[PDB]
Design an enzyme around this catalytic site. Structure first.
Site, mmCIF file in Angstrom:
data_model
loop_
_atom_site.group_PDB
_atom_site.id
_atom_site.type_symbol
_atom_site.label_atom_id
_atom_site.label_comp_id
_atom_site.label_asym_id
_atom_site.label_seq_id
_atom_site.Cartn_x
_atom_site.Cartn_y
_atom_site.Cartn_z
ATOM 1 N N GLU A 60 0.723 -1.363 0.061
ATOM 2 C CA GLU A 60 -0.103 0.021 0.136
ATOM 3 C C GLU A 60 1.021 1.188 -0.088
ATOM 4 O OE1 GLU A 60 -2.916 1.692 -0.948
ATOM 5 O OE2 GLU A 60 -3.946 1.415 0.659
ATOM 6 N N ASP A 88 -2.432 -4.978 0.905
ATOM 7 C CA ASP A 88 -1.727 -3.742 1.702
ATOM 8 C C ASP A 88 -0.358 -4.403 2.199
ATOM 9 O OD1 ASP A 88 -3.703 -1.569 2.334
ATOM 10 O OD2 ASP A 88 -5.003 -3.380 2.448
ATOM 11 N N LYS A 114 -15.381 -6.892 2.665
ATOM 12 C CA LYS A 114 -13.914 -6.951 2.463
ATOM 13 C C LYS A 114 -13.833 -8.364 1.957
ATOM 14 C CE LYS A 114 -11.309 -3.131 3.186
ATOM 15 N NZ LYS A 114 -11.356 -2.413 1.998
HETATM 16 O O1 LIG Z 1 -6.606 1.169 -2.559
HETATM 17 C C1 LIG Z 1 -6.593 0.293 -1.616
HETATM 18 O O2 LIG Z 1 -6.015 -0.579 -1.587
HETATM 19 C C2 LIG Z 1 -7.667 0.653 -0.569
HETATM 20 N N1 LIG Z 1 -8.683 1.578 -0.417
HETATM 21 C C3 LIG Z 1 -9.730 2.084 0.548
HETATM 22 C C4 LIG Z 1 -10.645 2.991 0.639
HETATM 23 C C5 LIG Z 1 -11.685 2.927 -0.157
HETATM 24 C C6 LIG Z 1 -12.867 4.045 -0.349
HETATM 25 C C7 LIG Z 1 -12.604 5.159 0.468
HETATM 26 C C8 LIG Z 1 -13.701 6.178 0.516
HETATM 27 N N2 LIG Z 1 -14.296 6.755 1.403
HETATM 28 N N3 LIG Z 1 -15.063 7.835 1.058
HETATM 29 N N4 LIG Z 1 -15.017 7.872 -0.409
HETATM 30 N N5 LIG Z 1 -14.187 6.665 -0.883
HETATM 31 C C9 LIG Z 1 -11.300 5.204 1.162
HETATM 32 C C10 LIG Z 1 -10.486 4.411 1.216
HETATM 33 C C11 LIG Z 1 -9.336 4.317 2.205
HETATM 34 F F1 LIG Z 1 -9.439 3.357 3.359
HETATM 35 F F2 LIG Z 1 -7.915 4.238 1.654
HETATM 36 F F3 LIG Z 1 -9.355 5.714 2.901
HETATM 37 C C12 LIG Z 1 -9.388 1.197 1.711
HETATM 38 C C13 LIG Z 1 -8.540 0.084 1.785
HETATM 39 O O3 LIG Z 1 -8.428 -0.697 3.102
HETATM 40 C C14 LIG Z 1 -7.440 -0.292 0.843
HETATM 41 O O4 LIG Z 1 -6.839 -1.328 0.857
HETATM 42 MN MN LIG Z 2 -6.941 -1.887 3.196
HETATM 43 MN MN LIG Z 3 -5.068 -1.245 0.044
#
Ligand SMILES: O=C(O)c1[nH]c(-c2ccc(-c3nnn[nH]3)cc2C(F)(F)F)cc(=O)c1O
Ligand SMILES: [Mn+2]
Ligand SMILES: [Mn+2]
Length: 174
Positions: A60, A88, A114
């Site tokens: 990540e 991650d 998830k």
């Molecule tokens: O790119 C990754 O791998 C990734 N992306 C997320 C993620 C997804 C959507 C929002 C969001 N919140 N409000 N609108 N969109 C925020 C996130 C954040 F947690 F990164 F902030 C979670 C993960 O756990 C992960 O692993």
């Molecule tokens: Mn994550």
């Molecule tokens: Mn991630």
């Protein structure tokens, strides 16, 4: 916005810059989507802190090219099946990829969300809450108690810092 100010005041510049870069790449302003900015910073912090327990590799934060290269490398050497989604972290002791979730909602609701997203049982799932609650795959929490408590303390502190500034209500409902 107070949220943007809090993010730059409670997160280290490297996390803030990487978070901005992620959002700015997809055409999102950390100023318009402030609550998403905070969540990306909070989640990245958790991933970096989890790795400092080398038993862990941090997928990540890396750009897609670098991230998939690291995953491809690990998969070719370890023989571990290639994940469909970029994970991650990668545990070298337990030899498995890890997905780290942080949720304002209840741990189980996010865990199952998830799991559905990554129907790959190979990828271990660890969910943390701002309320000091954690849910993991097969109840294998990976890290030592102290290590895990330190992550939860930071998450609670983030929540209370937002609440002192009256920002928690917006964050939890986003
Ligand atoms: O790119 C990754 O791998 C990734 N992306 C997320 C993620 C997804 C959507 C929002 C969001 N919140 N409000 N609108 N969109 C925020 C996130 C954040 F947690 F990164 F902030 C979670 C993960 O756990 C992960 O692993
Ligand atoms: Mn994550
Ligand atoms: Mn991630």
């Amino acid at each position: 916005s107070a949220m943007e100010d809090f993010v730059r005041q409670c997160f280290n510049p490297m996390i803030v810059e990487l978070a901005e870069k992620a959002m700015k790449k997809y055409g999102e302003d950390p100023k318009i989507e402030t609550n998403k900015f905070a969540a990306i910073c909070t989640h990245l912090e958790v991933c970096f802190m989890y790795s400092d327990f080398h038993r862990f590799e941090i997928i990540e934060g890396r750009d897609r090219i670098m991230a998939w290269t690291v995953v491809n490398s690990i998969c070719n050497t370890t023989g571990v099946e290639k994940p469909k989604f970029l994970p991650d972290l990668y545990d070298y002791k337990e030899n498995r990829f890890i997905e780290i979730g942080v949720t304002r909602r209840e741990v189980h609701i996010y865990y199952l969300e998830k799991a559905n997203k990554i129907k790959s049982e190979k990828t271990h799932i660890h969910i943390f809450s701002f309320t000091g609650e954690e849910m993991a795959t097969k109840a294998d929490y990976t890290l030592d108690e102290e290590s895990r408590a330190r992550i939860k303390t930071r998450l609670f502190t983030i929540r209370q810092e937002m609440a002192s500034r009256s920002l928690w209500d917006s964050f939890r409902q986003s």
